[PDB]
Design a protein around this ligand. Structure first.
Ligand SMILES: Nc1ncnc2c1ncn2[C@@H]1O[C@H](COP(=O)(O)OP(=O)(O)OP(=O)(O)O)[C@@H](O)[C@H]1O
Ligand SMILES: Nc1ncnc2c1ncn2[C@@H]1O[C@H](COP(=O)(O)OP(=O)(O)OP(=O)(O)O)[C@@H](O)[C@H]1O
Ligand SMILES: Nc1ncnc2c1ncn2[C@@H]1O[C@H](COP(=O)(O)OP(=O)(O)O)[C@@H](O)[C@H]1O
Ligand SMILES: [Mg+2]
Ligand SMILES: [Mg+2]
Lengths: 90, 279, 192, 184, 384, 51
């Protein structure tokens, strides 16, 4: 007990904390007006703070594979169903 | 009378000329080069050289005795040259690779789709990947898929075997690294392919043998030279191995290798597609 | 211009690496892979201006000191340049407000205000353990705290490409401290 | 704050330049002037208005309310320095300078924005300060001060994508290029 | 320099007056003799003329080489920096006493002849293992032991400060000291108090870092540890956590348990070899005393065996007095409720409560520590 | 031939470089035509699965 001065637990993020990680990461994407990110963060039942960038970077690929220049709100819900599929893989 | 001496100074450039490499400059009209005899020097210039033709890592010319800057050169490498494009493509089409729906699609998104449609990656801003690492069990089309990319490409393709950087003489290897990427710089929006990186990028080292001190200097060049990119050049590095265990995670940091492709072994669904193509 | 036909016939100058100076205007310089040389200095060069571990120019006929060649690298700088930690800040932290308050009480405060614990008379803390599932931001929080109070964020992984900058063999791990007590408000970081 | 602040600048245009239309505009702006602690931007607008002879008690209840928010900064700057965070004196009033930007004139803004510009080491607070410098540069029509900080804005976006800091920015040149006669 | 070591009257005697007035005559006669050399044979300055004669002999390029042997008639085989070694001659201004095989030398540039020797720049492991300054407070910081505090001074401190008591007894002091007990009872803490007090050089190494990754590198590190300890002074070697050489197996070590064993055989030599040992004391500390080799704990290598118990409930109260000395303790608290909270709380547990309770005060910007600080302290420290 | 290692000694570093030069010259980027290879061993237990 004298060795380590303070131990800090990191929980997986909840619904309020999955939202703002999406908010900070979506700063550098080209967005379309009217998205409702709150619906997107509720689709992920607490994976971690690392799949959030796993989704938001991959959501650009859907808009690029159909040759768009703005990321739409149906690209994210298309992206959640692929990243959480590997959650269901092993 | 000044125009008489203006041409008279170039007697120094005559024939018997040796080759160094530019490193930096102290000031106006005086610089530091490193010879291909291995030793570095503090040298003088010749005034007719446009200074703004210098330093990516510029191959220069040096006087064989007095050893100062003489002339700047077009780039050069011996290994390999540029994939001579007439009788060099290994003529495998995409259709010969059966049952690789994910990976043929996904190596397209990281190698040649950011090669041509570059501005969409710029306009959406999704940070196109610098290099790619492909791996898996032996006999899953690692070398085969690289053949098909190098057949349907429009960009320059540079193809090296990654066990040739260990030359006998000292310093040959780090020179052999830095002129590959210089040749991928000057030529084109090119593509680098390096195979069997296990011959270079291992985990354990030993600074007492000399055969292992050289390999330590091999890796620190390409780890340096992959940091000398500025998102503007379209130089993509494809790298393929057999054992992903025996690799340093210093090589797999973001900024150097961000995309990892496994080639798993096919089971039934991709298995019957292979029988269609071969038979 | 006409002098350049004559002056360029002069031979080149060697470059070296000063280890440390000694008595009677002499220094100890090593060349590329060439041996260590005890050479003298020229009159236009101050001794105290000659830093240990600093390049120089060097003539070749007599090996006389010529000019100070600037600032090559610190080996601590090249070590972090190999590892390339993803530099972070507080502005990219998503929803970790209570942990930021905890980590500042242990690391941020005993630098900017070391007097504040003498008012309580307790020993200042030294070691922090961070835990949780992987991918929840352990690295970016530790990188941010070193970034916002000007600390030299050193992470050790026990590699061997790292090894040539710490020492030749490093029979201990404790040889890391010689670079660490030279960048005195530093932070050591370790992975799983 | 400066977020409802452009409607004030339109309503000042709505006050003066329609000459007969000068009655409901001096009512609803005064409906916003003698609340929300506005002191500075309307002395000549009172001179462009009628007499409004007793505004002294209307000023004294607000310049006191100006001081009450001013002195609680003066009650914060000594507790934020005793146990310092990230310069929490400045870090408190880096949000309360924009109040003092609205309440005072540009001088309490310009010396505190350039104060806190050297505080933050990431641009995400810097670049929001620069947008505050732009918006006051439209009210006082500082056509020469916008030329500096727009480049100083634009120099920050390239690291990162920052499209909410880029696409919002394109609106500011868009309203400036239509302020000048530059339609293409 | 070392002209006369005799001081023994230590008074106003004529003998101290006579001795130094004899030395007054031997000095001035030595002065006036050597004064007559330059009077009758000027012939040079001798301040720089013989110096610049040497400095013009030795060239301005001075290559650094390496000895590997000596043949006594002023020529020896030296190694160049490349690897091609020569058979050069040795000068006469070379002070042929500081020449060991492997010592750095100064060669000529032309004929590579041995001009001078060079001082070594040592070492990046001596300075690792050598404690620079005194660590912390005195023996008054400990409190409560009082029986083994006497024991350690008996073996280390009193042999050094009073070398009279053993001679009148006709005895040699006991050699080795081992400290064992439950974890966190103050084993490492007492060794800081020895490093406070002593004037000897103090060397410290953890037992975990004796094990290496190459073959034979382990026993090589033990041979050069006691090399360093002997070549300085009277010295103290402190080896902490020496059970960790045997309990944990690491996959970095290429040799398995039969390389740990060869390391322990070398350490087993260095404590009681047949070589002349010198003045080196060894202090060892562990908490798993039953695990290690009894061949290493035999008398002859380790003489004194010191047990540390858990703190007693009247010595626990002493420890709370120590760690809460300079803190602004509010009068809400009663220390006696804190004593029997855990029945077997160590001395390390007490400092863990006292520091963490102070950290709870700084969350609320307070200056004194209340009772509910300690109430939520032991919930945080002990129970998890 | 060998298998591979998790890199025990320093000798078999540069043997696996000699071995991976052999594997590439067989079927990497070359029409290996009219060049037949015959190999013999007493025990094939210790051979690399890439070979
Ligand atoms: N569609 C296919 N998918 C996978 N393998 C195929 C396919 N068609 C043919 N092959 C066979 O796979 C062999 C291996 O090709 P390739 O050398 O690319 O595999 P590899 O993964 O590079 O193995 P190694 O790394 O050991 O060389 C080819 O020689 C070919 O005979
Ligand atoms: N009897 C004691 N008197 C004063 N302080 C003590 C006592 N016992 C423990 N401590 C405190 O506990 C801390 C740790 O003690 P120390 O590490 O020396 O115990 P240890 O038995 O050596 O631990 P380990 O068994 O882990 O080596 C010290 O900083 C000291 O302040
Ligand atoms: N709370 C968070 N806010 C923003 N980004 C996060 C967060 N947690 C993780 N990340 C992402 O995770 C990556 C950092 O990895 P990290 O989670 O620190 O590794 P570790 O598993 O050691 O904590 C970064 O790229 C970052 O974008
Ligand atoms: Mg292959
Ligand atoms: Mg201890």
């Amino acid at each position: 007990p004298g060795r380590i001065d303070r131990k800090i637990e990191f929980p997986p993020p909840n619904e309020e904390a999955r939202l703002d990680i999406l908010k900070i990461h979506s700063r550098k994407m080209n967005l379309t007006r009217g998205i409702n990110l709150r619906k997107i963060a509720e689709l992920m039942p607490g994976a971690s703070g690392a799949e959030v960038k796993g989704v938001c970077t991959e959501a650009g690929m859907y808009a690029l594979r159909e040759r768009r220049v703005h990321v739409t709100q149906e690209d994210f819900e298309m992206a959640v169903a692929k990243v959480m599929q590997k959650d269901s893989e092993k | 009378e000044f125009l008489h001496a203006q041409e008279e100074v170039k007697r120094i450039q005559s024939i018997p000329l040796v080759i160094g490499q530019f490193l930096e400059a102290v000031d106006q009209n005086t610089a530091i080069v490193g010879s291909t005899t291995g030793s570095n020097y503090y040298v003088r210039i010749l005034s007719t050289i446009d200074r703004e033709l210098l330093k990516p890592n510029a191959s220069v010319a040096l006087h064989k005795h007095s050893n100062a800057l003489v002339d700047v050169l077009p780039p050069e490498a011996d290994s390999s040259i540029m994939m001579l494009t007439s009788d060099q493509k290994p003529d495998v089409m995409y259709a010969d690779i059966g049952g690789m729906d994910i990976q043929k699609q996904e190596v397209r998104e990281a190698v040649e789709l950011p090669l041509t449609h570059f501005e969409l990656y710029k306009q959406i801003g999704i940070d196109p990947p610098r290099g790619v690492l492909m791996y898996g069990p032996p006999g899953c089309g690692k070398t085969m898929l690289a053949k098909a990319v190098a057949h349907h490409t429009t960009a320059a393709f540079i193809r090296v075997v990654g066990s040739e950087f260990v030359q006998k003489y000292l310093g040959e290897g780090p020179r052999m690294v830095r002129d590959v990427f210089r040749l991928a710089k000057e030529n084109a929006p090119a593509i680098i392919f390096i195979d069997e990186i296990d011959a270079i990028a291992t985990k354990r080292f030993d600074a007492q043998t000399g055969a292992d001190r050289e390999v330590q200097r091999i890796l620190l060049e390409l780890l340096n030279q992959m940091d000398g990119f500025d998102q503007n050049v379209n130089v993509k590095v494809i790298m393929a191995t057999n054992r992903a265990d025996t690799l340093d995670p210093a090589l797999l940091r973001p900024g150097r290798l961000d995309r990892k492709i496994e080639f798993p072994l096919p089971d039934r669904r991709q298995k019957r597609l292979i029988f269609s193509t071969i038979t | 211009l006409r002098e350049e036909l004559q002056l360029l016939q002069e031979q080149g100058s060697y470059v070296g690496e000063v280890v440390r100076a000694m008595d009677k205007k002499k220094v100890l310089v090593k060349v590329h892979p060439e041996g260590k040389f005890v050479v003298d200095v020229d009159k236009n060069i101050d001794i105290n201006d000659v830093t240990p571990n600093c390049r120089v120019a060097l003539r070749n006929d007599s090996y006389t000191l010529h000019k100070i060649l600037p600032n090559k690298v610190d080996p601590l700088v090249s070590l972090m340049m190999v590892e390339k930690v993803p530099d972070s800040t507080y502005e990219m932290i998503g929803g970790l407000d209570k942990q930021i308050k905890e980590i500042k009480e242990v690391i941020e405060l005993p630098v900017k205000h070391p007097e504040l614990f003498e008012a309580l008379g307790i020993a200042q803390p030294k070691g922090v353990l961070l835990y949780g599932p992987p991918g929840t931001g352990k690295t970016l929080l530790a990188r941010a705290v070193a970034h916002h109070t000007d600390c030299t964020f050193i992470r050790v992984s026990g590699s061997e490409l790292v090894q040539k900058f710490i020492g030749e063999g490093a029979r201990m791990v404790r040889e890391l401290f010689v670079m660490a007590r030279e960048h005195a408000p530093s932070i050591i970081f370790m992975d799983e | 704050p400066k977020n409802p602040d452009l409607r004030i600048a339109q309503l000042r245009f709505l006050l003066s330049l329609p000459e007969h239309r000068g009655d409901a505009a001096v009512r609803d702006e005064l409906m916003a002037a003698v609340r929300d602690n506005n002191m500075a931007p309307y002395y000549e607008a009172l001179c462009k208005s009628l007499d409004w002879q007793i505004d002294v008690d209307l000023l004294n209840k607000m310049k006191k309310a100006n001081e009450d928010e001013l002195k609680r900064l003066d009650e914060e700057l000594e507790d934020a320095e005793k146990n310092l965070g990230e310069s929490e004196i400045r870090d408190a009033m880096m949000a309360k300078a924009e109040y003092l930007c609205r309440i005072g004139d540009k001088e309490g803004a310009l010396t505190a924005f350039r104060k806190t510009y050297d505080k933050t080491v990431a641009l995400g607070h810097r670049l929001d300060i620069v947008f505050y410098l732009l918006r006051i540069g439209l009210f006082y029509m500082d056509n020469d001060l916008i030329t500096r900080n727009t480049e100083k804005a634009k120099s920050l976006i390239e690291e990162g994508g920052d499209w909410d800091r880029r696409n919002r920015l394109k609106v500011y040149q868009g309203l400036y290029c239509v302020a000048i006669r530059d339609f293409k | 320099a070392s002209k006369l070591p005799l001081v023994t009257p230590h008074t106003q005697c004529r003998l101290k007056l006579l001795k130094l007035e004899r030395i007054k005559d031997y000095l001035l006669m030595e002065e006036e003799f050597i004064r007559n050399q330059e009077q009758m044979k000027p012939l040079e300055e001798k301040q720089e003329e013989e110096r610049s004669k040497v400095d013009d002999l030795r060239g301005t390029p001075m290559s650094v080489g390496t000895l590997e042997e000596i043949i006594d008639d002023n020529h020896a085989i030296v190694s160049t920096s490349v690897g091609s070694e020569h058979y050069v001659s040795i000068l006469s201004f070379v002070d042929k006493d500081l020449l060991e095989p492997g010592c750095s030398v100064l060669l000529n540039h032309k004929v590579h002849a041995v001009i001078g020797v060079l001082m070594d720049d040592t070492d990046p492991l001596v300075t690792v293992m050598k404690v620079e300054k005194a660590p912390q407070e005195t023996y008054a910081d400990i409190g409560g032991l009082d029986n083994q505090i006497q024991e350690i001074k008996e073996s280390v401190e009193l042999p050094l400060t009073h070398p009279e008591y053993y001679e009148e007894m006709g005895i040699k002091p006991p050699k080795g000291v081992i400290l064992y007990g439950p974890p966190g009872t103050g084993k490492t803490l007492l060794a800081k108090a020895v490093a406070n007090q002593t004037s000897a050089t103090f060397l410290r190494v953890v037992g975990s870092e004796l094990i290496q990754k190459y073959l034979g590198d382990g026993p090589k590190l033990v041979r050069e540890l006691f090399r360093v300890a002997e070549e300085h002074a009277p010295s103290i070697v402190f080896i902490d956590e020496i059970d960790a050489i045997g309990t944990k197996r690491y996959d970095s070590n290429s040799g398995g348990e039969r390389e740990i064993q060869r390391t322990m055989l070398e350490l087993l030599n260095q404590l009681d070899g047949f070589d002349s040992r010198g003045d080196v004391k060894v202090i060892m500390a562990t908490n798993r005393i039953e695990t290690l080799d009894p061949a290493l704990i035999r008398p002859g290598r380790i003489d004194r065996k010191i047990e540390f118990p858990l703190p007693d409930e009247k010595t626990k109260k002493r420890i709370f007095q120590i760690h809460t000395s300079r803190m602004t303790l509010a009068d809400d608290v009663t220390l006696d409720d804190l004593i029997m909270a855990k029945d077997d709380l160590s001395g390390a547990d007490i400092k863990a409560i006292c520091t963490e309770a102070g950290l709870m005060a700084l969350r609320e910007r307070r200056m004194k520590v209340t009772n509910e600080d300690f109430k939520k302290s032991k919930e945080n420290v002990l129970y998890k | 031939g060998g298998r591979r290692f998790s890199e025990g000694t320093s000798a078999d570093r540069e043997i696996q470089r000699t071995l991976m030069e052999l594997l590439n010259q067989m079927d990497g980027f070359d029409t290996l035509h009219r060049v037949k290879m015959i190999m013999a061993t007493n025990r094939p237990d210790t051979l690399d699965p890439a070979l």
